[PDB]
Amino acid sequence: TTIMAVAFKGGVVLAADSRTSTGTYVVNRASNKLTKLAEKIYCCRSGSAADTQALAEQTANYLESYEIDTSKPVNVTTAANIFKKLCYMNKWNISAGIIVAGYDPLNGGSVYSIPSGGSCVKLDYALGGSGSIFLYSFFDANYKTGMSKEECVCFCQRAVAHAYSRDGSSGGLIRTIALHQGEPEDMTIPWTKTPYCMEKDPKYRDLAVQNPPFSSSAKITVNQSRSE
Amino acid sequence: TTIMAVAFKGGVVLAADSRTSTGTYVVNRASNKLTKLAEKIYCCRSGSAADTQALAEQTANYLESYEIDTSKPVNVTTAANIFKKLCYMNKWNISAGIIVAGYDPLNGGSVYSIPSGGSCVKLDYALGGSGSIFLYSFFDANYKTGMSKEECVCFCQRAVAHAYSRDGSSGGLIRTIALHQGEPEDMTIPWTKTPYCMEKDPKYRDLAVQNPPFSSSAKITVNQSRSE
Amino acid sequence: MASGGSVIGVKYNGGVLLACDTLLSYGSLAKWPNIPRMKLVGAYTVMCATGDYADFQEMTTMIENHVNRQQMYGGGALTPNEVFCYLQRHVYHKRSQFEPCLCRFVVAGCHGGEPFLGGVDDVGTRWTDDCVAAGYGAYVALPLLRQALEKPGGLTREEAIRVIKDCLRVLFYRECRAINKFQIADATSDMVSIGEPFEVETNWEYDGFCFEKTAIIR
Amino acid sequence: MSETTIAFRCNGFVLVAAAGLNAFYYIKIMDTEDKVTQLDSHKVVACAGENGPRVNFVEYIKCNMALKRMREHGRVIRTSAAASFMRNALAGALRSRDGAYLVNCLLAGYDVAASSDDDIATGPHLYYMDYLGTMQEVPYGCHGYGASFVIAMLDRLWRPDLTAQEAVDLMQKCCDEVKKRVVISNDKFICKAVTENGVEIVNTVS
Amino acid sequence: MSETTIAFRCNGFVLVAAAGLNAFYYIKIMDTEDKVTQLDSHKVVACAGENGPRVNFVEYIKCNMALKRMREHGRVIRTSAAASFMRNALAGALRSRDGAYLVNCLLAGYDVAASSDDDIATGPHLYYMDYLGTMQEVPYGCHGYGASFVIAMLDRLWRPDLTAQEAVDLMQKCCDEVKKRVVISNDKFICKAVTENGVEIVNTVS
Amino acid sequence: TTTLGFHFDGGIILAVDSRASSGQYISSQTVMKVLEINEYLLGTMAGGAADCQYWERVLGMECRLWELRNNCRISVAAASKILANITYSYRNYGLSMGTMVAGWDQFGPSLYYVDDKGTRVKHELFSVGSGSIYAYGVLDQGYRKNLTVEEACELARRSIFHATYRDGASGGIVTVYHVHQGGWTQISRDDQTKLYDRYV
Amino acid sequence: SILTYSGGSCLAMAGDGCFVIVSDNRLGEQLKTISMEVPKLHVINESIVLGLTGLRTDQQTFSEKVRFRNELYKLREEREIGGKAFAALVSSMLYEARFGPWFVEPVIASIDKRTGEVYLCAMDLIGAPCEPEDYVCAGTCAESLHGMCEALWRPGLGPEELFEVAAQAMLSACDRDSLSGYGAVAAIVTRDKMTTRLINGRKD
Amino acid sequence: WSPYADNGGTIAAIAGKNYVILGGDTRLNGDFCIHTRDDRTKLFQLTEHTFLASTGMQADRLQLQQMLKYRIQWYQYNNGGKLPSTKAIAKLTSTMLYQRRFFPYYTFNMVVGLDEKGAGVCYSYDPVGSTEPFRYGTSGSASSFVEPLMDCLLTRQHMVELSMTETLEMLKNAFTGAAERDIFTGDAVCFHIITADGIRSELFELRND
Amino acid sequence: TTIVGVVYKEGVVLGADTRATEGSIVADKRCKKIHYMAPNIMCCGAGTAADTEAVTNMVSANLALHRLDTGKQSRVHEALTMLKRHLYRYQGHVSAALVLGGVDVEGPFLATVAPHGSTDRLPFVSMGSGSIAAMSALETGYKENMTLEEAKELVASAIRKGIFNDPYSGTQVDLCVITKTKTELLIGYDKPNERKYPKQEIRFPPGTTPVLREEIRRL
Amino acid sequence: SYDRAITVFSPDGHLFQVEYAQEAVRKGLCAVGVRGKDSIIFAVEKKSVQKLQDSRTIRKIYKLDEHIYLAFAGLSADARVLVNHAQLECQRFRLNYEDAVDVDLLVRYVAKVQQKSTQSSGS
């Protein structure tokens, strides 16, 4: 999996790849890892799908009850704390890494990481899943504060694509969603329009010279293509 | 460790961090992972230092003998094959990941990766060590063919620094060496002049708001800095 | 399993210093370089821990809540010594259920012009002293603070800062999972204050560190 | 299987016998423990296995049977009901927290008409049981390391119409064969007989 | 420790005894294996342990001693040299590929002057050995599960000046105690005596 | 540890040693391995010291309640049963015990062995502990029913002594008690090294 | 453990142109006692005493190797080996067997016949020497011997006071040890004489 | 992660006809390190005549000390304000240790105090509570050499009454030797002398390395 | 163990503590951990004492033949290299860990050798169980072109950190100083743990211990 | 679950539930016990001779164990419950103590079962 969320001024963007895998074989190539928790709060799920589906469903059930009582839209910090507690109480029984992000009028766009073990950290961006370890340096090198909604969607799409081109365990579609004072905006990019893959990157077009012909020179030139 | 080698027109650059560690504690903060095998062939060592010191020493011993016999400078492919065979014959007894690179007049600058298990692959660049997994995306996103010697040294220094800022097991100096038809050029950059670290990167200056004061509002602002 | 590295602390004439870096790791990955790890607990007291950051969050929450509630419902403001005692009981209890708090705490504070500093480990061991540490602090820092405190009559604030920084510099040099970015809290005059992050000056330019001398093969 | 037990049923009796030995590892503590426990006036049970499971088990049978006889004006329970009761308790314990009784049993009874209304077939019955709760009526049966030797002799020599005197001779020979061929020492046997007139010890069988 | 052996030295002899039993798991194959092997005219060794290590071991001792006696005009070797030879081979095997001989031994000899030039102290010697190569001269010694019982009786009753008749009585009582208290059956003992006139079987000790 | 007991015409003898040995280091030479439960019943203790002392103290608390409730002394059969049922119920909980219980009630002298699994056996001669395998050697030679009290105390003393001499974990002082109709009587304590010189 | 299978303890102390070495007399198989008359001391020559503890088969075998090499040394070299060379030799033999050791721990005590200087050595089972100036000890009650000697030993002592120190030590330590005991044997060595004494102890 | 840590160090006590003397070292050890050289938790006063002294895991000794301190407060409330004697506390402590048979305190403890006749006594316990009353006792890291030395000097079994002062000197000597040789024992010793009058205390330096 | 080395303007200073332990008991308080390799090369040793002793001896013997053969002074690099080949072969079964220091025609040389056979030449090193504590004195106190006195004060202070904070190290500081021209051992350079309470003398009057039997032998 | 307090004191130290229980005993058929030298005789009155009643009548004297009988007066169904508890108790005792329960012991068990029913809420 590769999940991530990024804050921009006024909102957040959440992004994810679309693959569910048993290790070597893809059982679903079109999952939806961006799960809704309330009108403007979503989470990005990584780890066991069974666990993170059950904890998201449970977190959503609690928040809908709370919003009816209070009669108010719910703040991101509430979503994050409810989830966190579920992730902490069950830490030994699950495999889950979660990102909760959202928009609310009191604190704007916010992002919480809730990794394995059930800590909860409030950030400007968060990465998660197996594919995350390829993006730290990407973000360190290429990410900036101050990005608009449109810059941030585009940047997320390009990060996911970099991750999933090198991570065997990520791949497929790129889904995003942008949450802000206006209406939720979702987007799905098919693999055939991905902004990056190694298959289309010109520095990987020409093949390594692993198979030179039997020759009378130590000079290396081209791969042998036809029998002698 | 973070090691790498890059081809440019006429030569190669090899780069490495300077840390040797027991896991958690640094036993040497100024190692030299760029080892000389012949006048214009070097290797970058990762893994067990005991193993890769013994295999490099052995590879160097063989190449010096071969150059006296032949009376000629040795080609990179020869270095790479000798090493590869040592890495393959002992694969079950060692932990080693090697990069051999060099300059020779017949084939110019060349780079071979020889990872664990003893395969040998001929590339335009190679990454290795624990810190390598942070640089795939860096290189995919930022690396180009056609770079001059000076662009390539600089690019390597910046890659190593990105790697070692996120990898607990890399750090310290950045050493490089540039090999081409002229004289070998080595460079060592101290951590205080590193081209990247998270400590000096302005998007990590302001601290996460993990410790807000006890308040009468759900609004989050600043970390509590002084007792009430 | 976001986890914090070393913490260190030292008493000087008039108060006590606690210091750590702002990093949470996950295994070898340096994941968050801008986390404030120190937590103010009540009026006089400050805590930090090495180990599992989730277990620190949970334990300080529980404590900060007892302390704030007790104060608000007429039972006065708990002191460092009391906070410390309550912490150690809860660490111990959890160990006794085989659900430990996998952290090692350092606690500091100042009440009645008397500075506190003590440690609690994950099976409930507790001790107070003039210098305490957790993590690689215990192996790397304590030999220096202890040497420093050998002088008779104790340490001034400034000499306590100098020696805190030398320890920080050695951690940065010899502890893998660290960064050059630190905060210091200072308990003194019956209140704690946390400083802005800072960096220490390091040395990398010795002749014995040059390329030719460290080369394995000439 | 350090303690051999033996039993067989003939037309008008059951002989039962069990080895006296009680041991602590290799040490013989004593060789005269009576393990052929009388349950009622016309029943015995020979149990094999450790003192503790063995005693607790047969005391629990005895007390529950005793309680069934006063809640029933002293009416004797049939052998096949005592066996069914024993079996349910071995089986129950096997799926319980505290786990199985590690005892192997032979239950021998002679059933005798309660009243005149009673149509019961009157005679001797033997039941084999195991610590799991297996239970099976049999004409002869054994437990312990001496079991195989004796089972084959009895397949060879046992008939239904042995006289009381011939069946003591046969019981004696089965005990000698156990002594001759089992390395664990079963040096002394106590042997009891169950008849229409009740339980009685057989002294000439040692 | 299924096979008890016993030995003690008195002023003018050694008595040695070993249990006849040979077993396959719990089955008694036979109870009359002689395990008190004569090595020469005034030596015996009682070995304890499996047939195979035990036979191979004592056959190797016998043949090497026999070879030492022709390469030396039939001169009898001293008991302390036979023991030293036995010990070196137990110890050697213990660090070898094929591993240790799992035999425990008691070597008993009576040393007798070769010639007139010979200054040797003439009399009985007993040596305890173990499968590791421990070796120690002793006034009495034992191996197997019956060893502890017998060692204490002998601490209680053994003296150096027992007559040949008293020492047979004492050997008999030690064999009875083994039978009475060891659960493994050591039912029959063979007992030999080593004297100035040589090795001789003791028939009244069973 | 070594303990023995046996029944003869004049009553019962119990004898013990007093060493407590982890297995190498010797923690004490002064353990009291006979437990005066009350003034007509004795226990002995072998195996785990804490286990034997806690459960015989509990036994002694039940023997006393019985005697308050019923106005009479509990039998040796029932005493051994209370203790066999506690051990039986703890069978799966890792106790370590090898006890004798001895008394003289209305049916005469009774000696029981009771162990950590719930065994309970009545018999005329027992020895328990690591040195039991040497005590029985001496005790089987000398024992008979018609021993005098003086001869029987000597037999028991000599038996424990011979165990201390050869067993690594037995040693110390040898103590002999006599259970008679009137209750019981501590007969002697003698250091085993001083006994060595008496018997050589 | 295998080094504790057979039982036994040894101790050596230095004085002023003298030493004393003591051993217990017990041989065992774990807790079962086989003999009470097996002292563990071996006299090499007029100047050198060897103590060996550990597994008895390996004590027996390793002392026979020492004896064999010493005899050949004496014929080649036509002299007695000195305490220090004998110890270096012993060390070499233990380490020959570094990946498959002799389970012995030797205590060597010696005196230079000329200078009257006392050399003590103890070795681990692969021959690492520990050569202090006060005392050395080994075997199953070595922990309890350490503190007896730290509190009784003092520099300077002559043969008779060094003998009491060293006998009280061995006895009090064997008495808290189940695998060493049955009294002791002591050799007391000066440049001029070698005295041996059998000391009484407990019979457990 | 084990629930068990051994923090090291040593205690020792000696009784005589109307006093007992009790010593414990002040080092608290971690894993290959030293937390502090001035821990005083090993010795804990329970009444004016009775002490508890403990080694092993320090967090456990702090729990046991508190459970004892409240059973003792409860006795007083249920007993007319009186304190239990030393013999009673020793029996109480055994009882309590046994009760954790199944997850035990990692502690080697002593209850040390005056008896009812005014004389010293020491009860050494194992971790589940078997004990006896003795004239001297020791436990912890250095105890396997301090104990034969006290056997030697006080009982003199292989040879042919002390003051408070001579006894305090013997113990001082025994801790000094323990610190020289036991690497986990050191820094200082806290000594309490118990008489009917009261309790005198005295620190005493030891090797720092 | 705590062993330390530093390079200074004209040579090398090695340092060591002196406690050897078996288990948790001090076997020898004043053991010598600084070993001769050659006239101009010494070694301090940590790890398994037998292994550290065997390998140093062996390489010191082989360096001595090499000097008789060549008629030249041993080079520190030659020692380092014979050491590492030997430890490499045995795959860390021979578990020697060494600080090696010397001075030869190419100047001062200081290196560590770990048990698996890896080497590192560096201007300051520590090894052994007190290596961490020691290393914290060295990073706060090393500088370039230290004088002899400053070097000695830094090594001693680094060893004293081990002595007082690591339980497996103790007693006193030994230094060794190596220069172009001489090697100077300095046993007990610093003795920070002398006695305080002078030992109580406990006396046994001769004839305190009962002897059963005595024999005498005149030499 | 029903927990009401049934047996309570009233204004002069009277427990009426207990009194009225003893009234019920006074209406029940007469029973007699008589202790001889070495025999005990229990004798009870039966309701009334009928042609229809079964000749083998039900017994109103119960065995508690091989050596202990009981006869009663009062509510016959309550008594059958009481006799059950007592039969259990005797067998429990054999199992806990091997010996056979003493009469005097068994009497205190029964009497305490009656006493508890005068103080146990719900009953």
Numbering used by the authors:
A (entry chain V), B (entry chain H): 55 to 282
C (entry chain b): 1 to 218
D (entry chain Y), E (entry chain K): 1 to 206
F (entry chain Z): 111 to 310
G (entry chain J): 2 to 205
H (entry chain a): 33 to 192, 198 to 246
I (entry chain I): 67 to 285
J (entry chain R): 2 to 124
Give sentences from the paper.
The 20S core particle of the proteasome consists of 28 subunits organized into four rings of seven proteins each. The two identical outer α rings limit entry to the central proteolytic barrel made up of two identical adjoining β-rings. Three of the seven β subunits harbor protease activity, β1 (caspase-like, preferential cleavage after acidic amino acids), β2 (trypsin-like, preferential cleavage C terminal to positively charged amino acids) and β5 (chymotrypsin-like, preferential cleavage after hydrophobic amino acids) and are expressed as proenzymes with the active site threonine only released after full assembly of the core particle through an autocatalytic mechanism.
We generated CryoEM structures for the apo forms of both the native T. cruzi proteasome, purified from the parasite, and the recombinant proteasome. The native proteasome structure was determined at 2.31 Å and the recombinant structure at 2.25 Å. While the resolutions of the two electron potential maps are similar, the clarity of the recombinant protein map was considerably superior, particularly for many α subunit regions, allowing accurate protein model building and confident placement of over 1000 water molecules. Excepting the higher quality of the recombinant protein map there are only very limited differences apparent between the two apo structures (RMSD of 6258 aligned residues 0.85 Å). There are three cysteine residues which exhibit differences in the native and recombinant maps. For the native proteasome all three activities were equivalent, whereas the recombinant proteasomes exhibited different rates of turnover for the different substrates, with caspase substrate turnover the fastest. The structures are highly similar, further confirming the suitability of the recombinant proteasome for drug discovery and other studies.
